[PDB]
Structure 1
């Protein structure tokens, strides 16, 4: 469920090799997505 999305080179938070790790989750309330900065 771990998807990596490379940070665009024109982004304010851009660093070499940085990406957004976006995961989808769902519990009893409902669905949501988590974006964690990784290398």
Structure 2
């Protein structure tokens, strides 16, 4: 899942987005957000 970085964000650069994915293991559910282009 691909979410373009808000253009007014401190870390905005052209073409930059947060890749967000949901995971779940024996302990529980979580979300990871990695910056991509």
Q: TM-score range by the shorter chain?
A: over 0.9
Aligned pair count reads 37
Structure 1: runs of 5+ lacking an equivalent: none
Indicate the SS of the match to 2:33.
Answer: strand
Runs of 4+ in 1 over 3 A off after TM superposition: none
Let me know the Cα RMSD of the aligned residues: 0.2
Separation (CA, whole Å) in 2 of partners of 1:33 and 1:22? 7
